[PDB]
Amino acid sequence: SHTVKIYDTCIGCTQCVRACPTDVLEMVPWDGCKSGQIASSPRVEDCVGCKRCETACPTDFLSVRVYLGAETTRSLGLAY
Amino acid sequence: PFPTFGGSTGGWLRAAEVEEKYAITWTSTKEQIFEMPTGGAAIMRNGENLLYLARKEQCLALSTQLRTFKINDYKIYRIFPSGEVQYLHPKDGVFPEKVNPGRTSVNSRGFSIGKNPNPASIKFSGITTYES
Amino acid sequence: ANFIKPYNDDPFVGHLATPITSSSLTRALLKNLPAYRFGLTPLLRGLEIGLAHGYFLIGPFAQLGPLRNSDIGLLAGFLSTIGLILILTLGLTIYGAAAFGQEKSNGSELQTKKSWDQFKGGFFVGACGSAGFAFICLSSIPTFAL
Amino acid sequence: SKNVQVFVEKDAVETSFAKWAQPGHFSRTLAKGPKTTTWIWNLHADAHDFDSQTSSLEEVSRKIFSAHFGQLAIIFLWISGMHFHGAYFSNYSAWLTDPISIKQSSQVVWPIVGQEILNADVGGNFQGIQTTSGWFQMWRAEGITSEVELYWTAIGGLAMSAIMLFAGWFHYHKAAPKLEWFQNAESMMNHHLAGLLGLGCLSWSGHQIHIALPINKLLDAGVSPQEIPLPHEFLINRDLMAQLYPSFSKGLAPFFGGNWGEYSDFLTFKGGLNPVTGGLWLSDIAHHHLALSVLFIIAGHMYRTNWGIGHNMKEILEAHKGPFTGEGHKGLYEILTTSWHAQLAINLAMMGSLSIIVAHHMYAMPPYPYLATDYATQLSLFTHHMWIGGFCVVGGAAHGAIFMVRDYTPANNYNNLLDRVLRHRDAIISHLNWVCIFLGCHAFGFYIHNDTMRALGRPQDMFSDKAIQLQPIFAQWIQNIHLLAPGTTAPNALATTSYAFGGDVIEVGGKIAMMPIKLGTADFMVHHIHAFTIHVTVLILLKGVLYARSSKLIPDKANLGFRFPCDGPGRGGTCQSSSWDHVFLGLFWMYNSISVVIFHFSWKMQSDVWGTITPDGAISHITGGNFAQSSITINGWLRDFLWSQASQVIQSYGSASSAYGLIFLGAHFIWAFSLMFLFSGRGYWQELIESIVWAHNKLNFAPTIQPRALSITQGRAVGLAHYLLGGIGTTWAFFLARAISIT
Amino acid sequence: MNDFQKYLSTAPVLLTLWMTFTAGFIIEVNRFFPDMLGLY
Amino acid sequence: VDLDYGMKNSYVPATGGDGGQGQFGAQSPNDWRVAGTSPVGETSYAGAADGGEEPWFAEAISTVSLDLQKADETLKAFTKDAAAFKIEEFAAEKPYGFTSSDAAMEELVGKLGYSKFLEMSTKQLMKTWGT
Amino acid sequence: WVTFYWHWKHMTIWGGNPGQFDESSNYIMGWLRDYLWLNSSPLINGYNPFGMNNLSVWSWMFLFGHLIWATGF
Amino acid sequence: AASFLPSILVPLVGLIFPAFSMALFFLYVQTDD
Numbered sequence A: 001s002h003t004v005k006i007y008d009t010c011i012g013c014t015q016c017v018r019a020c021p022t023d024v025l026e027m028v029p030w031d032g033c034k035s036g037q038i039a040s041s042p043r044v045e046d047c048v049g050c051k052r053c054e055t056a057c058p059t060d061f062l063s064v065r066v067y068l069g070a071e072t073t074r075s076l077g078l079a080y
Numbered sequence B: 001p002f003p004t005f006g007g008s009t010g011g012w013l014r015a016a017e018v019e020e021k022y023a024i025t026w027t028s029t030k031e032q033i034f035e036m037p038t039g040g041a042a043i044m045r046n047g048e049n050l051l052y053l054a055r056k057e058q059c060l061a062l063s064t065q066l067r068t069f070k071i072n073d074y075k076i077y078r079i080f081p082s083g084e085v086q087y088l089h090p091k092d093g094v095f096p097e098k099v100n101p102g103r104t105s106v107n108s109r110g111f112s113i114g115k116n117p118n119p120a121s122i123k124f125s126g127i128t129t130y131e132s
Numbered sequence C: 001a002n003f004i005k006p007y008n009d010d011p012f013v014g015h016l017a018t019p020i021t022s023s024s025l026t027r028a029l030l031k032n033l034p035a036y037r038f039g040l041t042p043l044l045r046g047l048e049i050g051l052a053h054g055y056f057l058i059g060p061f062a063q064l065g066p067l068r069n070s071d072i073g074l075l076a077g078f079l080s081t082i083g084l085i086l087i088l089t090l091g092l093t094i095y096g097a098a099a100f101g102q103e104k105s106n107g108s109e110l111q112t113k114k115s116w117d118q119f120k121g122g123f124f125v126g127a128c129g130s131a132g133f134a135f136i137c138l139s140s141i142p143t144f145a146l
Numbered sequence D: 001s002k003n004v005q006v007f008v009e010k011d012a013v014e015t016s017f018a019k020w021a022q023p024g025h026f027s028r029t030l031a032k033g034p035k036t037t038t039w040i041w042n043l044h045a046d047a048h049d050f051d052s053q054t055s056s057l058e059e060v061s062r063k064i065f066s067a068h069f070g071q072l073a074i075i076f077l078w079i080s081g082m083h084f085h086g087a088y089f090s091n092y093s094a095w096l097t098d099p100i101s102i103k104q105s106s107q108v109v110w111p112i113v114g115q116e117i118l119n120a121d122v123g124g125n126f127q128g129i130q131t132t133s134g135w136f137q138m139w140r141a142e143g144i145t146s147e148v149e150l151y152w153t154a155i156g157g158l159a160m161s162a163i164m165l166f167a168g169w170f171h172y173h174k175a176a177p178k179l180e181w182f183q184n185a186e187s188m189m190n191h192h193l194a195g196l197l198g199l200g201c202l203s204w205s206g207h208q209i210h211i212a213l214p215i216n217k218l219l220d221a222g223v224s225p226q227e228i229p230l231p232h233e234f235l236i237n238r239d240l241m242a243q244l245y246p247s248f249s250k251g252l253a254p255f256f257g258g259n260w261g262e263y264s265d266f267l268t269f270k271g272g273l274n275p276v277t278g279g280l281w282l283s284d285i286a287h288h289h290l291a292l293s294v295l296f297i298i299a300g301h302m303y304r305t306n307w308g309i310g311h312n313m314k315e316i317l318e319a320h321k322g323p324f325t326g327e328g329h330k331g332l333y334e335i336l337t338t339s340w341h342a343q344l345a346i347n348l349a350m351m352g353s354l355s356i357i358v359a360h361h362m363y364a365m366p367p368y369p370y371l372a373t374d375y376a377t378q379l380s381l382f383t384h385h386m387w388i389g390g391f392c393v394v395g396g397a398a399h400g401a402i403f404m405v406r407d408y409t410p411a412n413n414y415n416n417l418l419d420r421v422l423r424h425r426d427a428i429i430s431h432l433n434w435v436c437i438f439l440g441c442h443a444f445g446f447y448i449h450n451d452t453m454r455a456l457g458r459p460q461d462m463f464s465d466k467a468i469q470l471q472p473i474f475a476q477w478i479q480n481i482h483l484l485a486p487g488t489t490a491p492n493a494l495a496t497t498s499y500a501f502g503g504d505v506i507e508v509g510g511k512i513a514m515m516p517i518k519l520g521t522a523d524f525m526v527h528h529i530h531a532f533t534i535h536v537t538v539l540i541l542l543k544g545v546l547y548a549r550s551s552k553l554i555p556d557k558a559n560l561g562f563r564f565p566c567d568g569p570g571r572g573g574t575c576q577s578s579s580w581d582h583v584f585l586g587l588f589w590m591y592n593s594i595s596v597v598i599f600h601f602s603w604k605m606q607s608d609v610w611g612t613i614t615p616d617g618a619i620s621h622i623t624g625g626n627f628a629q630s631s632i633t634i635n636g637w638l639r640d641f642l643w644s645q646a647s648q649v650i651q652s653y654g655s656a657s658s659a660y661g662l663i664f665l666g667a668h669f670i671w672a673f674s675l676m677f678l679f680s681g682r683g684y685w686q687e688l689i690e691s692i693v694w695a696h697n698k699l700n701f702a703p704t705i706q707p708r709a710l711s712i713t714q715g716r717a718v719g720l721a722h723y724l725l726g727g728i729g730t731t732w733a734f735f736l737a738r739a740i741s742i743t
Numbered sequence E: 001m002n003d004f005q006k007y008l009s010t011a012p013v014l015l016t017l018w019m020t021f022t023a024g025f026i027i028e029v030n031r032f033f034p035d036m037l038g039l040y
Numbered sequence F: 001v002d003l004d005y006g007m008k009n010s011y012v013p014a015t016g017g018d019g020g021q022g023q024f025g026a027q028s029p030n031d032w033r034v035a036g037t038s039p040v041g042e043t044s045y046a047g048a049a050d051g052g053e054e055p056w057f058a059e060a061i062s063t064v065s066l067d068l069q070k071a072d073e074t075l076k077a078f079t080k081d082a083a084a085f086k087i088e089e090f091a092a093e094k095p096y097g098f099t100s101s102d103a104a105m106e107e108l109v110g111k112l113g114y115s116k117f118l119e120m121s122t123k124q125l126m127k128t129w130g131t
Numbered sequence G: 001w002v003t004f005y006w007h008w009k010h011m012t013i014w015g016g017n018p019g020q021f022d023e024s025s026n027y028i029m030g031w032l033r034d035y036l037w038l039n040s041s042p043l044i045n046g047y048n049p050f051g052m053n054n055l056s057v058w059s060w061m062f063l064f065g066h067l068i069w070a071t072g073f
Numbered sequence H: 001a002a003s004f005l006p007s008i009l010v011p012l013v014g015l016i017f018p019a020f021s022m023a024l025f026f027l028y029v030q031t032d033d
């Protein structure tokens, strides 16, 4: 459904993965930052488009960007 | 192993029976009252507990509440109409907020957000700048 | 005593067993209604439903319509009812096409194309005929006086 | 020891001006300092939210008690000013002598910039603004007579204001009560229901029986105000009272004995309205308060305190449970004794509801001398109290929601009434939605149907008293019941409680005070519209309370708070999903509801009640009875009401009513101004600000407190505020200007 | 005193005082020199 | 367990503006667009639940559930690869008297259950398997 | 604003009283009272409790417009 | 006579035509080619 992309400016603060309401983001090993960790979006099929993740990023400009797109039952948050 | 609840009009509907359904499980050390996302209050059982919901978010919301009770053994599954089940969370046994060796990066762009291509350049291509 | 319990003993379904939802009265009435009754064929189900709905529809038009005070008011009311029945029938036809498709197999399941078509046909006949019956009845009203 | 005791902490807070110089001290976040303009706005928006400023109920409670003293001080100063202005800047004396001709005025403008035109020739060799609050009538009923007395009550008011302010300081800085003291509901109710209300009524009855009644009788008879004996004289010379009411001769002997009948001279159940003044008989009012006093005092002895006898509210609440309601009312006591928001909800709703009742009962049964004939005052009071009520009711709902989000605890509420309500919320809201649609389609449809029919030249097909008719049969029936009550179901009464139900036309000064108000098809149509408006308001507000903590869309709304902008652009859009936003939308519907009600009052009265009657029986209503056949269509309201009754404001220039014209226009402007906050978004504004800041920077200067655009929530608030001010303001001027002329 | 002076130095308070002064002087000018649509 | 059951759906990702099937598929294999209620003694939604004498509320009769025993299997299958990576690393770090990966797994999971095994660092594992 | 100006100016000219615009156009109340209020009398009386005329269709549309506008809100 | 056309066409254009058109659109948007 929606598209979430992570950029090299990430600092591995883990704040984004701790804010997702649907477990779409994970922290994976990396060497480009001091923390030695980067964020990934393995399960974008469950993204609802809340953008809470973006609100949590501390980088000058979001290192995590959510681009809204095709809509499915899951993305539209339909319990019915 | 269902927790003690008296019923509500905010439970699941047909989609749960014809499209898809979700289920969370956890273990408790005491019988305590929790608030369910559907609306209302329920009492968990002293031991294994199972509850069904219609959305993954509803399940994960309850997990947050469970963490307050110091319960961190919760598991979430998706049950399809035919009976097939998918284990969803914690996927690799380790919570996502904790780096676990063995997980590969996905959807990562190796440059600052400002280095994406110009829209005009990719015209009549079908791709987007952020996917280019 | 608790008169409200989880439906089907499922504490997590979105429904409750209240006196209104599950009482002998409600159960009995709904079981014997033409829509859910056992044994009725698709055509007969439609017929009964149509007979019922057509009889009460002539009233509103006949007594409150544009030509209510005219000597031909009842006739006009009948025509108006027939028009409404046609509109409703179009809806039924269209619904069936979209919901069921083009070729069916199960058969004798109100929820199939063939059965639905039969149901629709019954409704039309029953409704129009019922409206006609009301026309005949309203032509001369009995005072039931001895 | 004793269940009910007084616990107070001495010298709790030091009095100093240090915190005054540290704006934002109350908040941890704001205290750090200003970095953007948002800090400024937040300072003002979180000033009185004590729950977020401290985590101890005792502290929150202490602040509330003291803050209340502050409001009381302000109220006292307000009343004091009014009496003073009525002593030094009014024509009360002249009006007192000729109430029918002289017009009430208590405000005078300085002769600056032609504003003097606003000083009208009210009468009595006096020029000023015609006031419409009804002070003169009240003072006459009390028996003021002089302006010296008004001065003294003003001084008393100032003194009282000071005492209250001291009390606030004292009970917060020097003697602050502890939480245990506050949590004594039974005692509080016993004291407030027997002391505040019971003793209050009894005391008032004393004034009315010994001072007001006698003086007013003399005034009505014709005695010149100067010739009426001073109040103290009546209190001392029993003989004087005996002349007026021939029972004081017997003294209090009849009272101690069981012969209360002898006091029938001043305690009566006459009913109806005094023919001379057009107001309720004071004798009846005196008996009213006396009777109420006894009732309240008795009621104040129902709850247990420190002597065993009495009721414990907890027990009463818990016992009331049934087969369909689980644990019943268990858990409510704790909620109402541990949550200020919950208490405010109930109290605020009831207070607003009372105001609406006051509005209805105070016009049908005019309570003051020479009030009914003053159409301006009547209209002003009805509308004023109708509004105050609407706001308060919506406020109750708001604080109810704040409770659910901040104080509700699942553990303390298992299978109680509250829990069960939140467990079938879908059913409740679904049904109410339908009810609203049903009512709205049918009620408003009637009007649209009629408009179409009249325009198509088919008047015989309209829902009118001359065609298809929709008569209010039930109401017509109740009216008859109330009309025939005197002498039957109410044997000892002498007349109808109100002439509205039926009776004769009471006229004072050639003007109609009250007349039977009849109900027909038009009334049916409008009443059902009122139902629709109120029902929709409840839907929005109730939905907010029930879905405050969670919803299928946002399962964790509680954590987000009571006032969050949204959850995001996802799920298809989650804008305005907070409980605060439900209150935001509810206020708009409350505005609509009240507006229609006040308009109904204005047109119905000016068409079927108010007017003049000749010496013989010829009644000429102000508008001529147009309500019956014109209020059945929307075009009628636009033409026979708004367009026609607005001729006064639009043509007020060059007159003492010019102010209303200017305000009418100003209000329209503010209403429109608000639509820019209600339709736009923060994004556009923030970007515009960026460009503007560029200019300032280009000239080597820019504020360190970086300029930022108003928050999403504040934008909505600013819009609603201006919208309400503009709309209400417009009607305010429209009504007042029209009323001045009709009077 | 020092602290009170700081409170009196706050933005809201100073604005009100300044505007009251400005308004007053404008009103006073019109009181003594009234009705002017031009410098005569 | 068909780990691809969800992935095997009718959804076809679009060119641009779609995240894709993700990790567990984007949509249910089954179509939600089924029929409504049916008369007594009849069924509508294919493998639907008979409403008995209350066909009107048949959709409220659950037929989809989770077997606790089966739940264990799905947990193991979906986390098989992770377990493999974990044990592999443990093997790489010169295990004391190592035998076979599988054998080690059984021994290491005999103790420390399985969930605990998945959440333990190779170092902790080696310490645990010192014996 | 542009259209209102053209109409009112021309209306007064056609009516033979150009002075009304010349003097009342200086302040806002003039526009509301001498233009919108005064010239709305024919329209609001297209259909009344006493009959109807050829301006009925125009009257009805006027109210119809108000509805759509507010519904937009 | 052409004069009768207003009473024969208007009923069709304003009632029959719109209905069939709406029906066709529904069938078109509810079909899964």
Ligand code: CLA
Pocket: D433, D436, D437, D438, D439, D440, D441, D442, D444, D445, D448, D536, D539, D540, D585, D588, D589, G067, G070, G071, G072, G073
């Ligand atoms: C004139 C402007 C206008 C109108 C007509 C409406 C209409 C409505 N609002 Mg609304 N609203 C408005 C302005 C308006 N709003 C503004 C400015 C705001 C901002 C505060 C809101 C905020 C608001 C909220 C927050 C809520 C509403 C709700 C409602 C609905 C009430 C239910 C009802 O009576 O249905 C009847 C609707 C009618 C328009 C009645 C007239 C229609 C005819 C006369 C009846 C017959 C027509 C028939 C059905 C079809 C004819 C066929 C043919 C015409 C094609 C209704 C749809 C409530 C709602 O949805 O709950 C139900 C609700 O919760 N409104």
Ligand code: CLA
Pocket: C057, C060, C061, C064, C065, C066, C067, D441, D442, D443, D444, D445, D446, D448, D449, D452, D461, D462, D468
């Ligand atoms: C919504 C309010 C409303 C109502 C009640 C009416 C009523 C009426 N209109 Mg009118 N109209 C309205 C709005 C309304 N109008 C609006 C908004 C417009 C503008 C578009 C018009 C334009 C209009 C025209 C142009 C004409 C009318 C006409 C009529 C009359 C014919 C009635 C008819 O044929 O209905 C038929 C009704 C039905 C077939 C069904 C009625 C609903 C049923 C009774 C509900 C039953 C519910 C049931 C109790 C549920 C429980 C069941 C359980 C116990 C088993 C009637 C007096 C005609 C006339 O002669 O005027 C007098 C006419 O020519 N109307």
Ligand code: CLA
Pocket: D077, D078, D079, D080, D081, D082, D084, D085, D089, D107, D108, D109, D110, E013, E016, E017, E020
């Ligand atoms: C509800 C309260 C209330 C209200 C609204 C009014 C309103 C009015 N009174 Mg009135 N009055 C009141 C109570 C009230 N009064 C009381 C209780 C008394 C008894 C003392 C009086 C005694 C009184 C007299 C004797 C007179 C008025 C007059 C007036 C009118 C002119 C007001 C004025 O001075 O303008 C001009 C305003 C000023 C000169 C004040 C200057 C503005 C100050 C400096 C701004 C405030 C500074 C700010 C708070 C700084 C903050 C510091 C921080 C520590 C808080 C006005 C209509 C006058 C009138 O009608 O004359 C015809 C008049 O002569 N009143």
Ligand code: CLA
Pocket: D064, D065, D068, D069, D072, D181, D182, D184, D187, D188, D191, D192, D194, D195, D196
């Ligand atoms: C019989 C005793 C008595 C009386 C008269 C009151 C009266 C009042 N209480 Mg109260 N209270 C009492 C006992 C009493 N209380 C007890 C025992 C408790 C503890 C359980 C409380 C706890 C309490 C709280 C927690 C609060 C109140 C509040 C209030 C006020 C409500 C606002 C109102 O109606 O304004 C009416 C206003 C007036 C009538 C103005 C006059 C007020 C003075 C104080 C009356 C005192 C008597 C007076 C001097 C007459 C003496 C008679 C003499 C002339 C012969 C009101 C003044 C609220 C408030 O706002 O307090 C500030 C509030 O928050 N009370």
Ligand code: CLA
Pocket: D044, D045, D046, D047, D048, D049, D050, D348, D391, D392, D393, D394, D395, D396, D398, D402, D563, D580, D583, D721, D725
């Ligand atoms: C008994 C009355 C009463 C009391 C004690 C409270 C008390 C409270 N309310 Mg509440 N409320 C009430 C009535 C009341 N309310 C009513 C009637 C409504 C419906 C409109 C509301 C709606 C409401 C909302 C929606 C919210 C509160 C909140 C709050 C809390 C913080 C208030 C705050 O931010 O202070 C600061 C106070 C202000 C900034 C108000 C200043 C006045 C503004 C600027 C409007 C002025 C209009 C003015 C009269 C127009 C003059 C025109 C002129 C210029 C020409 C506090 C517990 C807030 C909260 O967070 O609760 C926890 C919150 O979100 N209330």
Ligand code: CLA
Pocket: C065, C066, C067, C076, C079, C080, C082, C083, C084, C086, C087, C090, H010, H011, H013, H014, H015, H016, H019, H020
């Ligand atoms: C151009 C379109 C059009 C036309 C030609 C008509 C024509 C008519 N309308 Mg009307 N209407 C329209 C649009 C139109 N409407 C719209 C858009 C609305 C919504 C606002 C309405 C709402 C409306 C109401 C509420 C009412 C009418 C009524 C009427 C009838 C009054 C005259 C008469 O003799 O009644 C007397 C009636 C008769 C003599 C019966 C005539 C025979 C009928 C019409 C046969 C219909 C069969 C038809 C083929 C079925 C359609 C099939 C489908 C596939 C299209 C007349 C037939 C009134 C009426 O009585 O309705 C029948 C009435 O109450 N109309």
Ligand SMILES: CC1=C(/C=C/C(C)=C/C=C/C(C)=C/C=C/C=C(C)/C=C/C=C(C)/C=C/C2=C(C)CCCC2(C)C)C(C)(C)CCC1
Pocket: C051, C052, C053, C055, C056, C125, C126, C128, C129, C130, C132, C133
């Ligand atoms: C309120 C209520 C109720 C209900 C009621 C109702 C709702 C009723 C209805 C009724 C109805 C609604 C009925 C109907 C009827 C119908 C009919 C009776 C019909 C008939 C028809 C016929 C007989 C035939 C026809 C025809 C045809 C078929 C075709 C051909 C032609 C002809 C004509 C032959 C009761 C009492 C139960 C109880 C209480 C509650």
Ligand SMILES: CC1=C(/C=C/C(C)=C/C=C/C(C)=C/C=C/C=C(C)/C=C/C=C(C)/C=C/C2=C(C)CCCC2(C)C)C(C)(C)CCC1
Pocket: D079, D153, D154, D156, D157, D160, D199, D203
């Ligand atoms: C207007 C006003 C005011 C007021 C004033 C007043 C109100 C005065 C009066 C005062 C008074 C003048 C009071 C009085 C009181 C009295 C009383 C309250 C009485 C009581 C009684 C009793 C207590 C009795 C008892 C008993 C009995 C029961 C019987 C037997 C014997 C005995 C003795 C035991 C002020 C200025 C504040 C402010 C402004 C406004």
